[PDB]
Amino acid sequence: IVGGYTCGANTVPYQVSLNSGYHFCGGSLINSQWVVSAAHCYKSGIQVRLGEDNINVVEGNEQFISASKSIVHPSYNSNTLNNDIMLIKLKSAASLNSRVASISLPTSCASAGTQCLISGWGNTKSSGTSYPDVLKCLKAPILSDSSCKSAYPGQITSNMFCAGYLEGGKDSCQGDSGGPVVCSGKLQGIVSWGSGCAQKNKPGVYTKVCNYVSWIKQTIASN
Numbered sequence: 001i002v003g004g005y006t007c008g009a010n011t012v013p014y015q016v017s018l019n020s021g022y023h024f025c026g027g028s029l030i031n032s033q034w035v036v037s038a039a040h041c042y043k044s045g046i047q048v049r050l051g052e053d054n055i056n057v058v059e060g061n062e063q064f065i066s067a068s069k070s071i072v073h074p075s076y077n078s079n080t081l082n083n084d085i086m087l088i089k090l091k092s093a094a095s096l097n098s099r100v101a102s103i104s105l106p107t108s109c110a111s112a113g114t115q116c117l118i119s120g121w122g123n124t125k126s127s128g129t130s131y132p133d134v135l136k137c138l139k140a141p142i143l144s145d146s147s148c149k150s151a152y153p154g155q156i157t158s159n160m161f162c163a164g165y166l167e168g169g170k171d172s173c174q175g176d177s178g179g180p181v182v183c184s185g186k187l188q189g190i191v192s193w194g195s196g197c198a199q200k201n202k203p204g205v206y207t208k209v210c211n212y213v214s215w216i217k218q219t220i221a222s223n
């Protein structure tokens with residue numbers, strides 16, 4: 001997260017860290033045994049880390065659970081990043097409490113202008129590399145489809161939306177991928193891609209979760 005602020009220990013209870021010897025992507029807990037993340041975060045040997053704040057120190061409240069299965073959307077395209085969504089099933093159910101809780105799936109899509117909370121342990125610098133120890137937060141509005149498509153001509157599909165600031169300075173970045181975009185208590189987006197980080201006229205692009213609610217529920221129901 002570039003231009004964000006320290007969230008505060010366990011203030012984003014649904015945030016998860018995907019780990020394989022190091023943090024490589026974020027995710028969101030949607031129920032005691034399932035996590036939603038980005039398809040481009042897929043890899044084998046994933047350990048899901050819940051209740052995390054400082055990812056480099058065991059502080060208490062953490063729950064480490066191996067992924068039993070990762071389900072990349074069958075229509076995921078790695079070149080266009082369309083359908084950039086993945087479901088991860090935990091080997092065992094997480095213990096839900098005030099520090100580890102699930103986030104609700106949307107019943108409807110969010111409109112432009114809606115303020116959302118984006119979080120992650122991604123890069124905090126636009127020009128350079130600097131990874132934080134503690135979870136960073138960022139409040140950012142969903143942009144109009146017109147502005148989004150003008151920023152990325154011919155690259156925005158109906159399954160994506162832009163969020164952030166056109167003047168640059170605040171954005172999601174590498175390492176934040178797969179993380180949550182929560183608006184009004186509902187998971188509306190998944191950190192997916194963009195051109196650089198916090199650059200002028202190049203807002204972050206996110207997977208539009210409201211288009212996948214039926215797919216998520218039907219997939220979870222059969223696994």
Ligand SMILES: NCc1ccccc1
Nearest residue numbers: 172173174193194204
């Ligand atoms: N600034 C958007 C973004 C998100 C994840 C990775 C790279 C860039």
Ligand SMILES: [Ca+2]
Nearest residue numbers: 054057058059
């Ligand atoms: Ca920790």
Ligand SMILES: [Cl-]
Nearest residue numbers: 214217218221
């Ligand atoms: Cl059905």
